Amino acid sequence: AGKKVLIVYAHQEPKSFNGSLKNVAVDELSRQGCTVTVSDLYAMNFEPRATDKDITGTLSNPEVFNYGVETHEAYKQRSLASDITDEQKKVREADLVIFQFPLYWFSVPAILKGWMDRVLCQGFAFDIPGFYDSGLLQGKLALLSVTTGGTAEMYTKTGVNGDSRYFLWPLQHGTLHFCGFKVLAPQISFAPEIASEEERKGMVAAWSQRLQTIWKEEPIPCTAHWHFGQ
Amino acid sequence: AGKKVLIVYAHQEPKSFNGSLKNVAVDELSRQGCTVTVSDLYAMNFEPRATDKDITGTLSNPEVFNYGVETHEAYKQRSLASDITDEQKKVREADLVIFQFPLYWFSVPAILKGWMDRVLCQGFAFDIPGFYDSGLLQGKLALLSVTTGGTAEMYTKTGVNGDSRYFLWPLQHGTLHFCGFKVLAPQISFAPEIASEEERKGMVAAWSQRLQTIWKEEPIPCTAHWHFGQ
Ligand SMILES: Cc1cc2nc3c(=O)[nH]c(=O)nc-3n(C[C@H](O)[C@H](O)[C@H](O)COP(=O)(O)OP(=O)(O)OC[C@H]3O[C@@H](n4cnc5c(N)ncnc54)[C@H](O)[C@@H]3O)c2cc1C
Ligand SMILES: Cc1cc2nc3c(=O)[nH]c(=O)nc-3n(C[C@H](O)[C@H](O)[C@H](O)COP(=O)(O)OP(=O)(O)OC[C@H]3O[C@@H](n4cnc5c(N)ncnc54)[C@H](O)[C@@H]3O)c2cc1C
Ligand SMILES: NC(=O)c1cc(N2CC2)c([N+](=O)[O-])cc1[N+](=O)[O-]
Ligand SMILES: NC(=O)c1cc(N2CC2)c([N+](=O)[O-])cc1[N+](=O)[O-]
Ligand SMILES: [Zn+2]
Ligand SMILES: [Zn+2]
């Protein structure tokens, strides 16, 4: 039996360092025999805004619009917009979701935030109850592959930015773990715009090399202690 | 004399609890004689995606698009899209910026993420050097007014979600502090949807009351210790 991978990719420029890391992931996972799909959010002009257009059916309560409630129900009625349900198919079938993005404001670019907000709806990714370790995507793996402007030392506890692990918490725990994913350790490629040609090559090579044995890695313990120390 | 307030507001439904919190803020700050402006993102259909459309006319390097470089240059050359510069004008003039939003995945809704992404460009909100306490918005105050689905107990260190301060980091430190704002203590309105109508009313009264003395408040210390201590 093989493995299915979805790469959710958020960068405007094919020739960027992010583009290189995404292409390398496709090549290496494809070479392994994996089933691979890429959602290139900017080329898709993916809609990030959570709005009433996300539901192609009778809006249940059209007097007071509640996005959570309307999308939950629309999920059950199979009446979500097709951009959403197309992504949900991709996610439903994946054994591994990789997110490839440059860090914007200690988080994901908005187009990618919008993918999280609209795709990962109640009924689909979680239920109440049915989250964290009972999240509806248990059994899947997830991996953040992030590039920064800041260097590694800036992202240490004694540095100006604090530990890079600090900003991971809403993504790794708040989102991914919440939906039931097991989380592989993040790939962080620090400061590529500042690095030499060779350092950049080494970072891209370190990532393809990691992907070779990706199916053998254990998930991190996705806890407050992993992220915060103490 | 006076002060000016910008409320950056991210909720699709005026009749929502978020809508009431926004309306009470406008009411009360207004009554005080403040100048008040609301950027109602969803009603503006505000563009969240960071794209080459954000630069007017001809790019500095159209072969390889770098969003950061291009927006930094367009800022100096006064060629940023008018939707961005319209917001920058509001922020420039503000003494206090209030963010009013529902928590979406331990962060801001994507439409508001894209506000941050596209509005707070280099040259305007920060430079290098010129960030953290030297950020270019220094002397300004910022405050997150956030509503949750989860209860206050869920957002303790021993609750399922972890302390609320953990998720504030990318916003308060990574973004607001980084641009030089001083950050007032967040206003967190826990689980309104679950509350009685009377409880909801009490939380709107509490927000109004706090705003009566907002100008008397001191900033939090925006450190890793505040967020992850103790
Ligand atoms: C809105 C905004 C907010 C930001 N917020 C933050 C923040 O909170 N924290 C932070 O740390 N940073 C922040 N940044 C910076 C951003 O994270 C970095 O600029 C980004 O991660 C760099 O990735 P890139 O793919 O765009 O690099 P690129 O600019 O594309 O370039 C890296 C270099 O490597 C070259 N390259 C491409 N492919 C290869 C390859 N295969 N082999 C060798 N070289 C290659 C490229 O041509 C280029 O010269 C922010 C930037 C923006 C625009
Ligand atoms: C995509 C997505 C991701 C989410 N992620 C998270 C997460 O990470 N963590 C989390 O905790 N939550 C999360 N949530 C939940 C979200 O934070 C809450 O649903 C939201 O904060 C509730 O605020 P509201 O304004 O929308 O409530 P409302 O639905 O508007 O409900 C409150 C009630 O108050 C009523 N009301 C309005 N004004 C008044 C007034 N003046 N007096 C009395 N009653 C009034 C309204 O009629 C309504 O019935 C997420 C939701 C979505 C859709
Ligand atoms: N590496 C950095 O010094 C850096 C660079 C940028 N810049 C160039 C886009 C941003 N940022 O925009 O938020 C933030 C940081 N930071 O470390 O927090
Ligand atoms: N009150 C909650 O239990 C709750 C509800 C939602 N809901 C309404 C969509 C989300 N969330 O979306 O991630 C998160 C939580 N949470 O505590 O982490
Ligand atoms: Zn976790
Ligand atoms: Zn800080």
Residue B101, strand partner residues: B146
Measured in Å, residue A106 CA sits from the centre of ligand 3 at: 9
Answer whether B49's CB lies under 8 Å from B19's CB.
no
- DSSP strand pairing (B182-183 vs B96-102): unpaired
Report how far Cα A176 is from the mean position of its chain's Cα atoms: 8
Nearest to A137 by CA among A158, A151, A116: A116
The CB density around residue B11, as the number of other CB atoms within 10 Å, is 26
- The C-alpha atoms of residue B40 and residue A52 are separated, in whole angstroms, by 16
Q: Which residue has the tokens 């003395």?
A: B213
Report how far Cα B219 is from the mean position of its chain's Cα atoms: 15
Answer whether A95's CB lies under 8 Å from A140's CB.
yes
Amino acid making up residue A18: N
What CA–CA distances, in Å, run from A176 to A69, A96, A120, A172, B4?
Answer: 21, 12, 10, 5, 39
Q: Is position A155 annotated in a ligand binding site? A: yes
Nearest to A12 by CA among A47, A45, A38: A45
3-class secondary structure, B9: strand
Nearest to A22 by CA among A189, A165, A172: A189
Write phi, then psi, for B65 (nearest 5 degrees).
-75, 115
Which of B110, B166, B173 minimises the CB distance to A169?
B166
Answer whether A186's CB lies under 8 Å from A147's CB.
no
Nearest to B221 by CA among B148, B153, B132: B132
- The C-alpha atoms of residue B215 and residue B1 are separated, in whole angstroms, by 12
Nearest to B178 by CA among B187, B169, B186: B169
Nearest to B123 by CA among B188, B175, B56, B74: B74
Rg (CA), chain B: 18
Burial class (CB in 10 A: 0-12, 13-18, 19+), A22: buried
- DSSP strand pairing (B4-9 vs A187-189): unpaired
What CA–CA distances, in Å, run from B24 to A111, B145, B220?
Answer: 31, 12, 24
Helix axes A17-31, A197-212, angle to 10 degrees: 30
Which of B117, B161, B178 minimises the CB distance to A109?
B117
Burial class (CB in 10 A: 0-12, 13-18, 19+), B37: middle
What CA–CA distances, in Å, run from B190 to A64, A190, B202?
Answer: 20, 36, 12
Distance, first Cα to last Cα, chain A: 41
Structure-token pair, residue B74: 């367009």
Which residues of A, range 136-175, sit inside 8 Å of B by Cβ? 149, 157, 160-163, 166-167, 169-170, 173-175
Structure-token pair, residue A175: 């989102």
Structure-token pair, residue B205: 């009264």
Which of B108, B160, B227 minimises the CB distance to A132?
B160
Residue A9, strand partner residues: A40, A100
- The C-alpha atoms of residue B84 and residue B208 are separated, in whole angstroms, by 30
Answer whether B22's CB lies under 8 Å from A75's CB.
no
What CA–CA distances, in Å, run from B129 to A25, A110, B124, B134?
Answer: 35, 26, 13, 8
Q: Which residues of B73-87 are buried (b: 16+ CB within 10 A; e: fewer)?
A: bbbeeebbbeebbeb
3-class secondary structure, B64: coil
Q: Does the beta carbon of B192 lie inside 6 Å of ligand 2?
A: yes
- Give me the domains of chain B, ranges plus CATH numbers: 1-230 (3.40.50.360)
Write phi, then psi, for B38 (nearest 5 degrees).
-115, 130
Nearest to B35 by CA among B76, B83, B3: B3
- Which is the closest atom of ligand 4 to the Cα of B148? 1
Q: Which of B166, B177, B179, B193 best probes binding to A when mutated, by most A CB atoms within 10 angstroms?
A: B166
Residue A6, strand partner residues: A37, A97
Answer whether A229's CB lies under 8 Å from A168's CB.
no
- The C-alpha atoms of residue B37 and residue A193 are separated, in whole angstroms, by 38
Technique of determination: X-ray
> What resolution in angstrom units was achieved for this structure?
2.0
The CB density around residue B24, as the number of other CB atoms within 10 Å, is 17
Nearest to B68 by CA among A13, A34, A64, A36: A13
- The C-alpha atoms of residue A14 and residue A11 are separated, in whole angstroms, by 8
Structure-token pair, residue A180: 């039931």
- The C-alpha atoms of residue B156 and residue B165 are separated, in whole angstroms, by 9
**Element (DSSP H or E) covering residue B183:** strand B182-183
Structure-token pair, residue A54: 């996300």
- The C-alpha atoms of residue A8 and residue A5 are separated, in whole angstroms, by 10
Helix, strand, coil content of chain B in percent (nearest 5): 45, 15, 40
Question: Which residues in chain A have Cβ-Cβ distances shorter than 8 Å to B105?
Answer: 113, 116-117, 120, 170, 174-175
Length reported for chain B: 230
- DSSP strand pairing (B141-147 vs B187-189): parallel
**Element (DSSP H or E) covering residue B167:** helix B164-171
Answer whether A47's CB lies under 8 Å from A118's CB.
yes
Length reported for chain A: 230
Within 13 Å of residue A50, how many CA atoms lie on the same side as its CB? 34
DSSP state string for chain A: ---EEEEEE--S-TTSHHHHHHHHHHHHHHHTT-EEEEEETTTTT---S--GGGB-S--S-SSS--HHHHHHHHHHTT-B-HHHHHHHHHHHH-SEEEEEEE-BTTB--HHHHHHHHHHS-BTTTB-SS--GGG-TTTT-EEEEEEE-SS-TTTTSTTSTT--HHHHHHHHIIIIIITTT-EEPPPEEE--TTTS-HHHHHHHHHHHHHHHHTGGGPPPP--SHHHHH--
Please, what's the largest Cα pairwise distance for chain B? Answer: 59
Rounded to a whole number, what is the distance in Å from the CA of A190 to chain B's nearest CA? 16
Burial class (CB in 10 A: 0-12, 13-18, 19+), A42: buried
Distant-in-sequence, close-in-space partners of A144: CB < 8 Å, separation ≥ 6: A99, A101, A168, A171, A172, A186, A187
Rg (CA), chain A: 18
- The C-alpha atoms of residue B41 and residue B112 are separated, in whole angstroms, by 7
Structure-token pair, residue A79: 């009446």
Structure-token pair, residue A43: 């080329």
Four-residue CA torsion sign, A25, A29, A31, A32: positive
DSSP B174: I
Ligand nearest to the CA of B161: 4
- The C-alpha atoms of residue B76 and residue B79 are separated, in whole angstroms, by 8
Residue B7, strand partner residues: B38, B98
Structure-token pair, residue A4: 């299915």
- The C-alpha atoms of residue A166 and residue B186 are separated, in whole angstroms, by 19
